[PDB]
């Protein structure tokens, strides 16, 4: 499913993402926007290293979920990468919380550095009641 902006913001808030390890809801929103356009079903294959990015946060198979076909990979979220393509994003949010428990936090995603870091991200949550 492709979330509407404010619908997603409220969905993430209910799931405990607001301020999780220091990360505001607007930063999570900016991440989802630029990674996937708020799209849970998106996959993107990285020909360079044979990994794939999954779902609304485009979480990578090399480190975070198992898809069986990424060489040398581990599965730190202990999930099939299939779980990251559901309309319900509970598992994707649990896995995003796992990513940012590591030292880099939200810097783990390069698109966040490019598109969100050091920017005014208030617009992503404007009017959403969050």
Curated annotation (Swiss-Prot):
Q: Kindly give the InterPro entries that the UniProt entry links to this protein.
A: Glyco_hydro_22, Glyco_hydro_22_CS, Glyco_hydro_22_lys, Lysozyme-like_dom_sf
Q: Which disease is it linked to?
A: Amyloidosis, hereditary systemic 5: A form of hereditary systemic amyloidosis, a disorder characterized by amyloid deposition in multiple tissues resulting in a wide clinical spectrum. AMYLD5 primarily affects the viscera, and the predominant clinical features are renal dysfunction of varying severity, and intra-abdominal bleeding. Inheritance is autosomal dominant.
Enzymatic reactions: Hydrolysis of (1->4)-beta-linkages between N-acetylmuramic acid and N-acetyl-D-glucosamine residues in a peptidoglycan and between N-acetyl-D-glucosamine residues in chitodextrins
Note the SS bond partners: 6-128, 30-116, 65-81, 77-95
Q: Tell me, what's a Pfam family for it?
A: Lys
Its BP terms in the Gene Ontology are: antimicrobial humoral response; defense response to bacterium; defense response to Gram-negative bacterium; defense response to Gram-positive bacterium; inflammatory response; killing of cells of another organism
Report the EC number(s), separated by commas if there are several.
Answer: 3.2.1.17
> Active site annotated at which positions?
35, 53
Of the GO CC terms on this record, one is: tertiary granule lumen
What is the protein's given name? Lysozyme C
What's this protein's function? Lysozymes have primarily a bacteriolytic function; those in tissues and body fluids are associated with the monocyte-macrophage system and enhance the activity of immunoagents.
Q: Where in the cell is it found?
A: Secreted
Q: Which organism is this protein's natural source?
A: Homo sapiens
Quote additional remarks.
Lysozyme C is capable of both hydrolysis and transglycosylation; it also shows a slight esterase activity. It acts rapidly on both peptide-substituted and unsubstituted peptidoglycan, and slowly on chitin oligosaccharides.
- A GO MF term: identical protein binding
Ranges for domain C-type lysozyme come to: 1-130
Which family is this protein grouped under? Belongs to the glycosyl hydrolase 22 family.
Keywords from the named record? Amyloid, Amyloidosis, Antimicrobial, Bacteriolytic enzyme, Disease variant, Disulfide bond, Glycosidase, Hydrolase, Secreted, Signal
Q: How does it assemble?
A: Monomer.
- Keyword Secreted belongs to the record: yes
């Amino acid at each position: 499913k492709v979330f509407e902006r404010c619908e997603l913001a409220r969905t993430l808030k209910r799931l405990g993402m607001d301020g999780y390890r220091g990360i505001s809801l607007a930063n999570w929103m900016c991440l989802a926007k630029w990674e996937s356009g708020y799209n849970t079903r998106a996959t993107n294959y990285n020909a360079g290293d044979r990994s794939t990015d999954y779902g609304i946060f485009q979480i990578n198979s090399r480190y975070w979920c198992n898809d069986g076909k990424t060489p040398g990979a581990v599965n730190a979220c202990h999930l099939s990468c299939s779980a990251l393509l559901q309309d319900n994003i509970a598992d994707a949010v649990a896995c995003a919380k796992r990513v940012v428990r590591d030292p880099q936090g939200i810097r783990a995603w390069v698109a966040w550095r490019n598109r969100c870091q050091n920017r005014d991200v208030r617009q992503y949550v404007q009017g959403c009641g969050v």
